[PDB]
Amino acid sequence: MYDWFSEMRKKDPVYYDGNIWQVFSYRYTKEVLNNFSKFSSDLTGYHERLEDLRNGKIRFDIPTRYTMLTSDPPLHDELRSMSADIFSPQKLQTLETFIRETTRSLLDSIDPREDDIVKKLAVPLPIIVISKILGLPIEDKEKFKEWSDLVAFRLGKPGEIFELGKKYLELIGYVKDHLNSGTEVVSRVVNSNLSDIEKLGYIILLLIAGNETTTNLISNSVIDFTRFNLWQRIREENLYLKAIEEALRYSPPVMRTVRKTKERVKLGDQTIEEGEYVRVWIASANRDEEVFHDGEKFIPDRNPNPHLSFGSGIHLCLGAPLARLEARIAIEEFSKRFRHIEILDTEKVPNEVLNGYKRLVVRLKS
C-alpha cells in the first residue's frame, strides 16, 4: 500500500476518514510521537487507576493494561528507569559471545537441501536471548513462543477469546512462579513500590515486546538482501550495520502505532479534537521523500538513516540496541555459512500492524 501512502503524503498528510485520524508524513508522525503532552499513550486507563492500584483497591485485572507502554510521564519515566540500563552499551555487549554461538548453534540445525529459516532461526533467537536476560528457563521456549502472540501491536479478531484466556491464565501463572527466580532486572521490579498487577505487567512486557518484532526484522532482512541481490556487496563492503538500518526503514516490522489526543490540538492544517484516536503510519513516514531522497529504493549504504521503526520520543523502543545487536549477528553469521540463497517458499503473517513472515523456505549452498 506504499503507492497510496505516497499519494496521501502529497494530498492529505494529516487525514481524517470518519472515525480516526491518520498521519502519513515524516514531519507530522515524528511530531505526534514526540509531543506527549498533547498526544497520549494512556489508552488502557492506567493513570486513572494508579491509586486504586497502589492502594490495593484493585485485586485482579489483565496485567498488560498497566505497563510503561500505555503511560505518560511522570509515571512513564518512573517505570522505564527501573530497567533503562539492562539494555545499555557495555551491558548488551557482554551478551555478544552468547548471541553468536547461539545463532551459530541454530544455524547447525538447518538443512540446506530445504528448510524454514523463520522456524529454525528467526523465531528462536530472540526468545532464547530474552530468556537469558530475564533469567527464565530456556526449556519453556515453546510456551514463550505462543504467548508472544499477545504483543500489544496485534489487534482483535473473532472467536479468539477462549484461546487468549487459556494463554493469559498460563502466562500470568508462569510469571508469578518465577518472580524470585530472576535476574537483576526482575529483582529491581519485584522490589519496587509498584503493585502486584503492575509487576506482572512489567515482566510480561519485557518478555514478549520484542519477540515477534525482532523475528520479523530478521526475516525481512533475509528477503530484502536476497531479492535485491545485496548479499555479496554486504559481505564484501561489510555493510551489515547500515544494511540492517535500511531493512528497518524499508520493511518495518511494526507498520503503525497509535496515540490519543489529550486535548484539542492543531496538527499541520488540521485541528484534531480532544479524545480522538490518531493513527501514525510509521511505514509511510519512512518513505517520506522530503526526508528520504530516493525513498522508494533500497539503498544498502544509506547514511544517515533517521527512520522511525523503533518509534521516537520518550517511548522509543526499549530493546532497539538489543534488536539491532541480534539481527546484525544473525545476518553476519548467516552470510558466512551459506554461499548462495534460493527462496523456495514464503507465507506472510496476516496482520495489519505486524509486517513479517510465517514461513520462509530456502535452499542454501554451504
Q: Which residues make up the interface to ligand HEM (CB under 6 A)?
A: 41, 68-69, 80, 205-206, 209-210, 213-214, 217, 253-254, 257, 309-311, 315, 317-319, 322-323
Backbone CA torsion sign across 314, 315, 318, 321: negative
Nearest to ligand HEM of 25, 70 (CB atom): 70
- 337 annotated to bind ligand: no
- 215 annotated to bind ligand: no
Least distance in Å: CB of 43 to ligand HEM? 10
- 80 annotated to bind ligand: yes
Nearest to ligand HEM of 13, 356 (CB atom): 356
Nearest to ligand HEM of 25, 355 (CB atom): 355
CA 151 to CA 59: how far, in whole Å?
23
Backbone CA torsion sign across 99, 104, 105, 111: positive
- 259 annotated to bind ligand: yes
Nearest to ligand HEM of 80, 119 (CB atom): 80
Least distance in Å: CB of 345 to ligand HEM? 24
CA 10 to CA 272: how far, in whole Å?
19
Q: Is the peptide bond before 74 cis (omega within 30 degrees of 0)?
A: yes
Least distance in Å: CB of 357 to ligand HEM? 14
CA 61 to CA 39: how far, in whole Å?
25
Least distance in Å: CB of 30 to ligand HEM? 11
Nearest to ligand HEM of 68, 364 (CB atom): 68
Residue indicated by cell numbers 484466556: 165
Residue indicated by cell numbers 528507569: 81
Least distance in Å: CB of 52 to ligand HEM? 22
Helices 124-134 and 211-227: crossing angle, nearest 10°?
140
Residue indicated by cell numbers 480522538: 276
Least distance in Å: CB of 207 to ligand HEM? 7
- 340 annotated to bind ligand: no
* 3 state DSSP class of 16: strand
> Any residues with CB less than 8 A from the CB of 208 and at least 6 apart, and which?
144, 147, 148, 150, 151
CA 171 to CA 150: how far, in whole Å?
10
Instruction: Please give the DSSP secondary-structure letter assigned to residue 364.
Output: E
Nearest to ligand HEM of 68, 222 (CB atom): 68
- 315 annotated to bind ligand: yes
Residue indicated by cell numbers 503511560: 71
* Residue positions forming the annotated binding site: 76, 80, 257, 259, 315, 317
* Residue positions forming the annotated binding site for heme: 76, 80, 257, 259, 315, 317
